[PDB]
Amino acid sequence: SLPDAYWVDGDTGLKQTTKNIWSNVFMTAEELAVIVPIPDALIADSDLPLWDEVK
Amino acid sequence: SLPDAYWVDGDTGLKQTTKNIWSNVFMTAEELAVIVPIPDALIADSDLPLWDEVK
């Protein structure tokens, strides 16, 4: 919020009051993940280096 | 106001007379003001310099 101001009615006009306000804002971390399983025989027999190719 | 001039009817016609006017304009000062009240407890408790924030 923001404060006000007001016009005074003459040399002895009664002055007025105001207030300011604040609030909170947030951020939340979340997780994503996956698994890729491979037979150890297929890792050895392949000429393509499958771990470096899936990364 | 502005003065006149007049065409004169021949070599020996009577010349006429004219005059100016002036007046006044005014500007008046007026007041705007406000009050911000805060408890002594909040000025001590809070870590924000709370009078310097509202100015």
PDB file of all heavy atoms in Angstrom, chain B residues 4 11-12 18 22 24 27 29 31 33 37 39 43-44 48-49 52:
ATOM      1  N   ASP B   4      -7.527  54.187 -28.301  1.00  0.00           N
ATOM      2  CA  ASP B   4      -7.992  54.362 -29.683  1.00  0.00           C
ATOM      3  C   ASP B   4      -7.127  55.335 -30.497  1.00  0.00           C
ATOM      4  O   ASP B   4      -6.300  56.063 -29.966  1.00  0.00           O
ATOM      5  CB  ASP B   4      -9.433  54.886 -29.664  1.00  0.00           C
ATOM      6  CG  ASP B   4     -10.479  53.874 -29.208  1.00  0.00           C
ATOM      7  OD1 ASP B   4     -10.216  52.657 -29.243  1.00  0.00           O
ATOM      8  OD2 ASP B   4     -11.605  54.306 -28.881  1.00  0.00           O
ATOM      9  N   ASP B  11      -8.639  69.603 -42.497  1.00  0.00           N
ATOM     10  CA  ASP B  11      -7.396  70.281 -42.096  1.00  0.00           C
ATOM     11  C   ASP B  11      -7.446  70.917 -40.690  1.00  0.00           C
ATOM     12  O   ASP B  11      -6.405  71.220 -40.112  1.00  0.00           O
ATOM     13  CB  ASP B  11      -7.013  71.316 -43.169  1.00  0.00           C
ATOM     14  CG  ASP B  11      -8.035  72.433 -43.435  1.00  0.00           C
ATOM     15  OD1 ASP B  11      -9.032  72.553 -42.690  1.00  0.00           O
ATOM     16  OD2 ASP B  11      -7.818  73.196 -44.399  1.00  0.00           O
ATOM     17  N   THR B  12      -8.643  71.113 -40.136  1.00  0.00           N
ATOM     18  CA  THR B  12      -8.955  71.906 -38.934  1.00  0.00           C
ATOM     19  C   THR B  12     -10.107  71.308 -38.108  1.00  0.00           C
ATOM     20  O   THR B  12     -10.749  72.010 -37.331  1.00  0.00           O
ATOM     21  CB  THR B  12      -9.292  73.360 -39.314  1.00  0.00           C
ATOM     22  OG1 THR B  12     -10.230  73.375 -40.362  1.00  0.00           O
ATOM     23  CG2 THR B  12      -8.101  74.205 -39.738  1.00  0.00           C
ATOM     24  N   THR B  18      -8.469  59.817 -25.569  1.00  0.00           N
ATOM     25  CA  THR B  18      -8.530  58.390 -25.174  1.00  0.00           C
ATOM     26  C   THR B  18      -7.714  58.070 -23.903  1.00  0.00           C
ATOM     27  O   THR B  18      -6.959  58.922 -23.448  1.00  0.00           O
ATOM     28  CB  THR B  18      -8.114  57.526 -26.377  1.00  0.00           C
ATOM     29  OG1 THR B  18      -8.575  56.207 -26.246  1.00  0.00           O
ATOM     30  CG2 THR B  18      -6.604  57.466 -26.569  1.00  0.00           C
ATOM     31  N   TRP B  22      -5.805  49.492 -16.126  1.00  0.00           N
ATOM     32  CA  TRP B  22      -5.101  48.322 -15.571  1.00  0.00           C
ATOM     33  C   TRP B  22      -5.940  47.656 -14.471  1.00  0.00           C
ATOM     34  O   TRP B  22      -6.898  48.237 -13.968  1.00  0.00           O
ATOM     35  CB  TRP B  22      -3.724  48.712 -15.023  1.00  0.00           C
ATOM     36  CG  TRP B  22      -2.673  49.119 -16.005  1.00  0.00           C
ATOM     37  CD1 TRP B  22      -1.642  48.348 -16.403  1.00  0.00           C
ATOM     38  CD2 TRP B  22      -2.456  50.415 -16.638  1.00  0.00           C
ATOM     39  NE1 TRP B  22      -0.797  49.069 -17.218  1.00  0.00           N
ATOM     40  CE2 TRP B  22      -1.233  50.362 -17.365  1.00  0.00           C
ATOM     41  CE3 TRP B  22      -3.129  51.651 -16.611  1.00  0.00           C
ATOM     42  CZ2 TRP B  22      -0.707  51.477 -18.024  1.00  0.00           C
ATOM     43  CZ3 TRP B  22      -2.608  52.778 -17.267  1.00  0.00           C
ATOM     44  CH2 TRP B  22      -1.393  52.697 -17.965  1.00  0.00           C
ATOM     45  N   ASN B  24      -5.591  43.855 -11.439  1.00  0.00           N
ATOM     46  CA  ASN B  24      -4.746  42.953 -10.657  1.00  0.00           C
ATOM     47  C   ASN B  24      -5.143  41.478 -10.817  1.00  0.00           C
ATOM     48  O   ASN B  24      -6.311  41.157 -11.006  1.00  0.00           O
ATOM     49  CB  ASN B  24      -4.798  43.360  -9.177  1.00  0.00           C
ATOM     50  CG  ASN B  24      -4.258  44.748  -8.905  1.00  0.00           C
ATOM     51  OD1 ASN B  24      -3.088  45.029  -9.062  1.00  0.00           O
ATOM     52  ND2 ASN B  24      -5.085  45.659  -8.473  1.00  0.00           N
ATOM     53  N   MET B  27      -2.490  35.097  -6.575  1.00  0.00           N
ATOM     54  CA  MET B  27      -2.195  33.701  -6.257  1.00  0.00           C
ATOM     55  C   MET B  27      -2.174  33.520  -4.739  1.00  0.00           C
ATOM     56  O   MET B  27      -1.539  34.313  -4.053  1.00  0.00           O
ATOM     57  CB  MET B  27      -0.859  33.308  -6.897  1.00  0.00           C
ATOM     58  CG  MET B  27      -0.377  31.922  -6.509  1.00  0.00           C
ATOM     59  SD  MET B  27       1.017  31.291  -7.450  1.00  0.00           S
ATOM     60  CE  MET B  27       2.305  32.449  -7.025  1.00  0.00           C
ATOM     61  N   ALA B  29      -1.475  30.865  -1.361  1.00  0.00           N
ATOM     62  CA  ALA B  29      -0.937  29.639  -0.778  1.00  0.00           C
ATOM     63  C   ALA B  29      -1.972  28.869   0.046  1.00  0.00           C
ATOM     64  O   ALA B  29      -2.692  29.443   0.853  1.00  0.00           O
ATOM     65  CB  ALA B  29       0.264  29.963   0.077  1.00  0.00           C
ATOM     66  N   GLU B  31      -2.383  24.801   2.299  1.00  0.00           N
ATOM     67  CA  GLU B  31      -1.602  23.798   3.028  1.00  0.00           C
ATOM     68  C   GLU B  31      -2.129  22.377   2.836  1.00  0.00           C
ATOM     69  O   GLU B  31      -3.321  22.140   3.001  1.00  0.00           O
ATOM     70  CB  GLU B  31      -1.569  24.165   4.514  1.00  0.00           C
ATOM     71  CG  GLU B  31      -0.662  23.233   5.317  1.00  0.00           C
ATOM     72  CD  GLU B  31      -0.262  23.812   6.676  1.00  0.00           C
ATOM     73  OE1 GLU B  31      -1.118  24.380   7.382  1.00  0.00           O
ATOM     74  OE2 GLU B  31       0.915  23.692   7.056  1.00  0.00           O
ATOM     75  N   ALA B  33      -1.086  18.386   4.445  1.00  0.00           N
ATOM     76  CA  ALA B  33      -0.393  17.806   5.578  1.00  0.00           C
ATOM     77  C   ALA B  33      -1.000  16.474   6.004  1.00  0.00           C
ATOM     78  O   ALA B  33      -2.182  16.224   5.786  1.00  0.00           O
ATOM     79  CB  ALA B  33      -0.493  18.802   6.727  1.00  0.00           C
ATOM     80  N   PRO B  37       1.060   7.929  12.977  1.00  0.00           N
ATOM     81  CA  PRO B  37       1.324   7.445  14.330  1.00  0.00           C
ATOM     82  C   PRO B  37       1.849   5.998  14.376  1.00  0.00           C
ATOM     83  O   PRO B  37       1.292   5.120  13.726  1.00  0.00           O
ATOM     84  CB  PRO B  37      -0.008   7.603  15.053  1.00  0.00           C
ATOM     85  CG  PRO B  37      -1.041   7.383  13.960  1.00  0.00           C
ATOM     86  CD  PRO B  37      -0.364   7.915  12.709  1.00  0.00           C
ATOM     87  N   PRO B  39       3.439   2.942  17.395  1.00  0.00           N
ATOM     88  CA  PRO B  39       3.799   2.539  18.754  1.00  0.00           C
ATOM     89  C   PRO B  39       5.301   2.391  18.981  1.00  0.00           C
ATOM     90  O   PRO B  39       6.007   1.836  18.151  1.00  0.00           O
ATOM     91  CB  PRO B  39       3.077   1.225  19.015  1.00  0.00           C
ATOM     92  CG  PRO B  39       1.874   1.310  18.099  1.00  0.00           C
ATOM     93  CD  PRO B  39       2.429   2.036  16.888  1.00  0.00           C
ATOM     94  N   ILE B  43       8.841   0.311  16.738  1.00  0.00           N
ATOM     95  CA  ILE B  43      10.087   0.992  16.377  1.00  0.00           C
ATOM     96  C   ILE B  43      11.289   0.251  16.958  1.00  0.00           C
ATOM     97  O   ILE B  43      12.321   0.164  16.303  1.00  0.00           O
ATOM     98  CB  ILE B  43      10.055   2.467  16.825  1.00  0.00           C
ATOM     99  CG1 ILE B  43       8.914   3.267  16.169  1.00  0.00           C
ATOM    100  CG2 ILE B  43      11.399   3.168  16.575  1.00  0.00           C
ATOM    101  CD1 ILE B  43       9.070   3.521  14.669  1.00  0.00           C
ATOM    102  N   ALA B  44      11.166  -0.315  18.156  1.00  0.00           N
ATOM    103  CA  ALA B  44      12.199  -1.149  18.756  1.00  0.00           C
ATOM    104  C   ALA B  44      12.244  -2.565  18.153  1.00  0.00           C
ATOM    105  O   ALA B  44      13.315  -3.044  17.795  1.00  0.00           O
ATOM    106  CB  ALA B  44      11.947  -1.187  20.263  1.00  0.00           C
ATOM    107  N   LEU B  48      13.579  -3.133  10.076  1.00  0.00           N
ATOM    108  CA  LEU B  48      13.441  -2.085   9.073  1.00  0.00           C
ATOM    109  C   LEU B  48      13.438  -0.687   9.739  1.00  0.00           C
ATOM    110  O   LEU B  48      12.719  -0.516  10.721  1.00  0.00           O
ATOM    111  CB  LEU B  48      12.127  -2.386   8.331  1.00  0.00           C
ATOM    112  CG  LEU B  48      11.926  -1.613   7.029  1.00  0.00           C
ATOM    113  CD1 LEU B  48      12.883  -2.075   5.932  1.00  0.00           C
ATOM    114  CD2 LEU B  48      10.500  -1.845   6.540  1.00  0.00           C
ATOM    115  N   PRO B  49      14.179   0.331   9.261  1.00  0.00           N
ATOM    116  CA  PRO B  49      14.228   1.668   9.872  1.00  0.00           C
ATOM    117  C   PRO B  49      12.951   2.481   9.598  1.00  0.00           C
ATOM    118  O   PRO B  49      12.882   3.325   8.716  1.00  0.00           O
ATOM    119  CB  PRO B  49      15.499   2.310   9.324  1.00  0.00           C
ATOM    120  CG  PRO B  49      15.629   1.677   7.943  1.00  0.00           C
ATOM    121  CD  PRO B  49      15.123   0.256   8.160  1.00  0.00           C
ATOM    122  N   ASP B  52      12.303   6.160   8.265  1.00  0.00           N
ATOM    123  CA  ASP B  52      12.962   6.469   6.996  1.00  0.00           C
ATOM    124  C   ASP B  52      12.263   5.813   5.804  1.00  0.00           C
ATOM    125  O   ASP B  52      12.332   6.326   4.695  1.00  0.00           O
ATOM    126  CB  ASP B  52      14.433   6.052   7.037  1.00  0.00           C
ATOM    127  CG  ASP B  52      15.256   6.762   8.110  1.00  0.00           C
ATOM    128  OD1 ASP B  52      14.805   7.780   8.679  1.00  0.00           O
ATOM    129  OD2 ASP B  52      16.402   6.328   8.349  1.00  0.00           O
TER     130      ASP B  52
END
